[PDB]
Amino acid sequence: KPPKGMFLSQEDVEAVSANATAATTVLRQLDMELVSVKRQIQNIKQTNSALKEKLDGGIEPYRLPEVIQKCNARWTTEEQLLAVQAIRKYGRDFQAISDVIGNKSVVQVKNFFVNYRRRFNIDEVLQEWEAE
Amino acid sequence: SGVEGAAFQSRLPHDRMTSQEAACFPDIISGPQQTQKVFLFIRNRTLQLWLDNPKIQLTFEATLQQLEAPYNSDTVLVHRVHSYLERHGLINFGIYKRIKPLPTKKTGKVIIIGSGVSGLAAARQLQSFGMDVTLLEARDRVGGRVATFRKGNYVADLGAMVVTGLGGNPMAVVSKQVNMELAKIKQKCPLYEANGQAVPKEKDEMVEQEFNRLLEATSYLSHQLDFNVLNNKPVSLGQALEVVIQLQEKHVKDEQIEHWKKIVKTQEELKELLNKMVNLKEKIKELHQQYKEASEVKPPRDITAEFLVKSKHRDLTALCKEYDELAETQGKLEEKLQELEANPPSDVYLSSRDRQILDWHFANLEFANATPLSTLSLKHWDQDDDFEFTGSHLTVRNGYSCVPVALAEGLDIKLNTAVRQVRYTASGCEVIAVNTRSTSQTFIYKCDAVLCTLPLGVLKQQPPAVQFVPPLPEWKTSAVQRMGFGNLNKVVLCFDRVFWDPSVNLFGHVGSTTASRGELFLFWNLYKAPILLALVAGEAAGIMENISDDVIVGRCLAILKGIFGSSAVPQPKETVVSRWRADPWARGSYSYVAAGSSGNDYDLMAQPITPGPSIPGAPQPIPRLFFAGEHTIRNYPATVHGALLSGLREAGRIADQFLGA
Numbered sequence: 177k178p179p180k181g182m183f184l185s186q187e188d189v190e191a192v193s194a195n196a197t198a199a200t201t202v203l204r205q206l207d208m209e210l211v212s213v214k215r216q217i218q219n220i221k222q223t224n225s226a227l228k229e230k231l232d233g234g235i236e237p238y239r240l241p242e243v244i245q246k247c248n249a250r251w252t253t254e255e256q257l258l259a260v261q262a263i264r265k266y267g268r269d270f271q272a273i274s275d276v277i278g279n280k281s282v283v284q285v286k287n288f289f290v291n292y293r294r295r296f297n298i299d300e301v302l303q304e305w306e307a308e
Numbered sequence: 309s310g311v312e313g314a315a316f317q318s319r320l321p322h323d324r325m326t327s328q329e330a331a332c333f334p335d336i337i338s339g340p341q342q343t344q345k346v347f348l349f350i351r352n353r354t355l356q357l358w359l360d361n362p363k364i365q366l367t368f369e370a371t372l373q374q375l376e377a378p379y380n381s382d383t384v385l386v387h388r389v390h391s392y393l394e395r396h397g398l399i400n401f402g403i404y405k406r407i408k409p410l411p412t413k414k415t416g417k418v419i420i421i422g423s424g425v426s427g428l429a430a431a432r433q434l435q436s437f438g439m440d441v442t443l444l445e446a447r448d449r450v451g452g453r454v455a456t457f458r459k460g461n462y463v464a465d466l467g468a469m470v471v472t473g474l475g476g477n478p479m480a481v482v483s484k485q486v487n488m489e490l491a492k493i494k495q496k497c498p499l500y501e502a503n504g505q506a507v508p509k510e511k512d513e514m515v516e517q518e519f520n521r522l523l524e525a526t527s528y529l530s531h532q533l534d535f536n537v538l539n540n541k542p543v544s545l546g547q548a549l550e551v552v553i554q555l556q557e558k559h560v561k562d563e564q565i566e567h568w569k570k571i572v573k574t575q576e577e578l579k580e581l582l583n584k585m586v587n588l589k590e591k592i593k594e595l596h597q598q599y600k601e602a603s604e605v606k607p608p609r610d611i612t613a614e615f616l617v618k619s620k621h622r623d624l625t626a627l628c629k630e631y632d633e634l635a636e637t638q639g640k641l642e643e644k645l646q647e648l649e650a651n652p653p654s655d656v657y658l659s660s661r662d663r664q665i666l667d668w669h670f671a672n673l674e675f676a677n678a679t680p681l682s683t684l685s686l687k688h689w690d691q692d693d694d695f696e697f698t699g700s701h702l703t704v705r706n707g708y709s710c711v712p713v714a715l716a717e718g719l720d721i722k723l724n725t726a727v728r729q730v731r732y733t734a735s736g737c738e739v740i741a742v743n744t745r746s747t748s749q750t751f752i753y754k755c756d757a758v759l760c761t762l763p764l765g766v767l768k769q770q771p772p773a774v775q776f777v778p779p780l781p782e783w784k785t786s787a788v789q790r791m792g793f794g795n796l797n798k799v800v801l802c803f804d805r806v807f808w809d810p811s812v813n814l815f816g817h818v819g820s821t822t823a824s825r826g827e828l829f830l831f832w833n834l835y836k837a838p839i840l841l842a843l844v845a846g847e848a849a850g851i852m853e854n855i856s857d858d859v860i861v862g863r864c865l866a867i868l869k870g871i872f873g874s875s876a877v878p879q880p881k882e883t884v885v886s887r888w889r890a891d892p893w894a895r896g897s898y899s900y901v902a903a904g905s906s907g908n909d910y911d912l913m914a915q916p917i918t919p920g921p922s923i924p925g926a927p928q929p930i931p932r933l934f935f936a937g938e939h940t941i942r943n944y945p946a947t948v949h950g951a952l953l954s955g956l957r958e959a960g961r962i963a964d965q966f967l968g969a
């Protein structure tokens with residue numbers, strides 16, 4: 177029930193009246209508290225300004241061009257051999273395996289996992305990936 | 309309505325009987341509702357007839373002829389109601405032409421100490437009732453703290469000068485009886501900071517509003533947090549305002565800390581994000597080099613060499629995708645951080661200019677209560693608030709003294725007679741007094757009753773100006789100690805020409821320090837001849853009394869020169885400076901509800917004193933020593949109307965005691 181924009185908690189009232197110099201002490205510690213928060217802002221602004229200056233250049237010297245490849249349905253020998261190595265390295269990450277081969281959808285990779293499961297010891301290969 | 313307005317104008321509920329009426333008509337208030345309504349109409353109509361023409365006595369016979377059936381059928385009831393109104397001063401008070409000239413058989417003898425308004429109003433009443441009345445006045449004039457300076461065409465009031473609203477105010481009746489040139493006080497009051505520049509309209513309002521909110525806050529602090537005792541002593545309005553202001557300054561710092569903490573939290577979230585990016589950039593940089601080395605193994609290559617190119621490629625685009633998202637988040641954070649960096653909460657609760665204007669509002673309150681805020685009871689300082697009259701405040705253009713001077717017509721007043729001792733016994737009273745012009749001329753006044761209307765300041769004196777034999781009992785002296793008696797002073801400045809704004813009755817000077825906030829803080833343009841009044845309030849009142857008039861007038865002219873220009877302000881032709889604390893017949897200006905006191909002390913002040921028996925085992929004596937004056941009326945203290953009412957009260961009380969009701 178205090179006026180709007182007045183602030184008057186029982187808690188704060190006692191803290192400002194419990195002592196002859198309670199008030200100025202309270203407000204002094206808030207002054208020093210605010211000073212040390214501003215001090216801390218200065219250190220992070222300067223720390224972050226140094227970090228921004230390391231990101232000068234972005235990653236633009238390092239971004240490859242984006243090639244699109246017509247998602248073909250036939251598995252060349254070379255494309256099957258890429259899949260087996262991508263399984264060895266990426267496990268069940270069907271998306272990464274697709275991205276490596278270039279012209280194979282995620283599902284086509286999944287289908288590959290079963291049709292060539294026997295002939296490519298795919299189980300052995302996944303076991304081989306889980307060691308490292 | 310009409311009979312309803314009569315009740316309202318008499319400070320009476322129109323649809324209900326008061327405690328006082330219950331005492332005089334217990335048969336009626338304890339009886340059926342229908343008779344109470346008949347009573348209430350008779351009372352309200354008799355009040356109306358009196359109010360509708362207060363220049364002539366309203367007699368019982370006149371009253372009955374003007375009542376109509378069914379109300380004029382119980383003539384005993386009408387006579388009882390009329391006499392009650394008459395005895396208690398609700399009709400036929402003040403100055404009225406008397407129909408039946410005053411009977412010569414006077415009954416009883418009353419000495420009245422003081423011929424201010426309270427003493428004068430009682431005396432008029434007691435004479436009307438047939439008693440022998442003498443007033444003893446120390447000064448060479450009537451009116452007490454109604455004191456009008458008059459020189460030539462210059463007329464200006466050194467004490468009371470404002471009639472509050474006329475609605476419910478008994479001064480309204482008096483003003484129809486006395487030629488008072490009442491004029492509305494336009495409340496607009498421009499402030500000028502210490503440098504003479506006006507306070508801009510934006511700032512005058514921002515601070516007045518804050519002043520009002522600070523007052524509300526102390527009241528919240530009083531009622532909701534029961535913050536009324538601190539360190540075993542009663543809390544004052546001053547302390548409460550300090551505590552409220554301290555907490556508003558605390559909240560401003562709390563809000564600043566909360567704000568910069570949101571910036572630190574966000575900077576740190578950004579620091580963590582940047583570290584994640586410089587490491588990812590390096591990882592990308594190193595990976596690209598690998599892709600470059602592997603793709604420079606010119607084909608034809610075996611399928612592991614091809615897998616190396618294609619998987620470094622895939623690994624690199626993923627890290628670039630991871631880095632592109634982290635940079636989208638970097639923009640979202642640098643946004644927050646720039647919005648926050650631009651929304652800083654308020655720097656300060658009040659600037660130094662703010663605080664000074666605020667102090668003018670505190671000085672204005674110190675004026676209204678004639679005391680520093682550190683002395684006002686937080687719990688009770690505004691207890692008379694629910695009794696304020698309605699209407700505009702007014703001033704008395706021909707000088708308020710016209711009222712006491714008029715009330716004094718026909719009374720036996722011994723001026724220049726300072727009471728020194730009040731003796732009251734089971735058999736009667738003796739008032740010992742001296743001539744103020746030669747204190748050796750001693751006077752003894754024997755009487756049935758003494759009405760003491762000495763100011764609370766005089767009652768407070770140690771050592772005493774007036775000795776009571778036997779001494780006042782502890783319950784009355786303790787009240788006298790607790791009650792506040794404050795101080796307020798005026799400087800009258802009489803010029804030959806008007807250099808201020810003629811359509812502006814008030815303007816303020818904003819002192820540069822809290823300590824001096826009461827010093828010449830307000831100026832009044834109230835009169836026909838070019839006169840400004842200047843107030844000295846609060847802590848400044850008492851301190852300025854030990855400064856010469858020439859210096860006080862000097863400080864005034866310096867202030868006015870700053871506001872209106874040095875060439876516009878001539879030297880005053882006449883100047884007067886009040887020193888009410890030093891006035892031994894006042895010892896202050898008017899009472900205030902001090903910390904540690906309350907409304908009940910005003911009731912205690914009004915209680916009459918009853919001596920003990922002369923012979924032991926003798927029947928209980930009647931009361932002998934009565935009290936009136938502004939310090940004796942709980943609901944209207946510190947005013948002229950409150951004093952007038954207190955005199956009417958005691959005259960009814962004394963007449964009931966010595967003439968019978």
Ligand SMILES: Cc1cc2nc3c(=O)[nH]c(=O)nc-3n(C[C@H](O)[C@H](O)[C@H](O)COP(=O)(O)OP(=O)(O)OC[C@H]3O[C@@H](n4cnc5c(N)ncnc54)[C@H](O)[C@@H]3O)c2cc1C
Pocket residue numbers: 421422423424425426427444445446447450451452453454466467468469470471472725726727728761762763766773774796797798888892893894896897898936937938939945946947948949951
């Ligand atoms: C500066 C000032 C401004 C004020 N502003 C207003 C205002 O505008 N409006 C308003 O309504 N009220 C105002 N008041 C208050 C108002 O003036 C008083 O409340 C009222 O006039 C006092 O009436 P009273 O009869 O109780 O006391 P007083 O008028 O003081 O009467 C007491 C009398 O007793 C006399 N006396 C004292 N000692 C002795 C003694 N030893 N022997 C004999 N006689 C003695 C005194 O000289 C005086 O005449 C103001 C007061 C002052 C001083």
Ligand SMILES: O=CCCc1cc(F)cc(F)c1OCc1ccccc1
Pocket residue numbers: 467468469470472675676898945946947
């Ligand atoms: O000069 C005298 C003013 C003293 C005074 C004391 C009161 F207790 C009540 C008043 F009505 C009053 O006078 C008019 C006034 C009203 C509000 C604020 C300030 C003054």
